[PDB]
Ligand binder design. Structure first.
Ligand code: DMA
Ligand SMILES: [Mg+2]
Ligand SMILES: [Mg+2]
Lengths: 217, 210
């Protein structure tokens, strides 16, 4: 009876406007909050904490905004990587190589023996994900199987719980390919305003639901 | 100019328990409600109304429950096929042959000149969808393009709005692959209890975002 958790960070610009601070300061608050959230997820017994770092669309922002966001996410790993297992995946060719180099070094220095994993997905987009898998195996296998697809999806297992703060009730580019029965929870609170109580109430909601997987009781 | 709506019907068993009626009677109420819903969607100017008939997982329900559901959904098309354009897609190899034959005949008899389309998706499952597309194009093209993928996905265009009644906030194998910018709306009302007002306020919510 092991569970994992996925978070869709949202609301950093609106939080900067709400607090009257720079976007840099809002992303610094995001780094702090994501370290908190990672600790909460571990305390609650989740085996992997997935964070959807970015969509492919995000990389059409300016280089300055891309560098600000990517540095803020990477700093989370800089701070916590020593005590957990870190991994990452996604449409890596759209991520500026500097962050891939640093995140690879952080993955190498993480505790691969840890029972808790922090997992970043970058450049999420189902179209890009599917095209990447196709192009990888095109003409090299007789047929695609469920095992191969599952072993090459960005998210390497089905996701149990998914939380999206920030007030948007939509999945954007972030729906996990191999999670047909993931439970979704949306809340209006901006990520940088989320408290441990907000997380706990989300968990009450998510854990109370009857999961039927398309079948009757 | 396209504007579409996807509905995930849910809550028929619970409604049968709420009303103290058989599952068959609850699914008959579902047929009536889905004909209503199709009319509402048409009145609201949607060009295609997508209805998720079944997941691959649903076809591991009992044969009786499968037959009850599939007959109720097909009865929707039996009633509406003459006045709209009907189409369907999905993992067709998991749908029992009886329903595929009848639905194919109804697709053939539907009004292809209509400016409104009712589109059933059956056997929804992202894994099965992707495997089917791969196996179709494997070794036959230099690379998969966004255009080819879009042209072979179960849902043939991006979905604007998605509505799931019945109180569960999950996609249950029904997520539309090529709709990264779809807006979602969930409500606790069981499908068979949804009024036109419930639909209207759902549309206010969806239309107010963008
Ligand atoms: C056809 C349709 C939209 C069914 C509703 O989903 P479900 O009851 O099969 O899924 P779950 O078991 O996750 O509630
Ligand atoms: Mg946003
Ligand atoms: Mg159901």
């Amino acid at each position: 009876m092991m569970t994992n958790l996925m978070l869709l960070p949202d609301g950093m610009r609106r939080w900067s406007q709400k607090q009257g601070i720079s976007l840099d300061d809002s992303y610094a608050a995001m780094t702090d909050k994501l370290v908190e959230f990672t600790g909460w997820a571990r305390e609650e017994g989740f085996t992997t904490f997935y964070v959807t770092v970015s969509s492919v669309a995000n990389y059409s922002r300016s280089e300055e905004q891309v560098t600000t966001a990517m540095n803020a996410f990477t700093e989370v790993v800089r701070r916590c990587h020593d005590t957990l297992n870190f991994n990452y995946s996604g449409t890596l060719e759209v991520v500026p190589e500097r962050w891939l180099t640093e995140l690879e070094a952080l993955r190498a220095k993480s505790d691969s023996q840890s029972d808790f994993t922090l997992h970043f997905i970058m450049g999420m987009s189902l179209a890009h994900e599917v095209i990447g898998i196709f192009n990888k195996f095109n003409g090299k296998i007789p047929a695609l199987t469920e095992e191969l697809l599952a072993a090459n999806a960005y998210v390497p297992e089905p996701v149990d719980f998914l939380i999206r703060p920030g007030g948007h009730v939509r999945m954007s580019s972030f729906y996990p390919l191999m999670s047909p029965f993931a439970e979704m929870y949306f809340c209006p609170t901006l990520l940088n305003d989320m408290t441990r109580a907000d997380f706990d109430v989300a968990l009450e909601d998510l854990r109370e639901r009857d999961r039927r997987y398309g079948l009757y009781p």
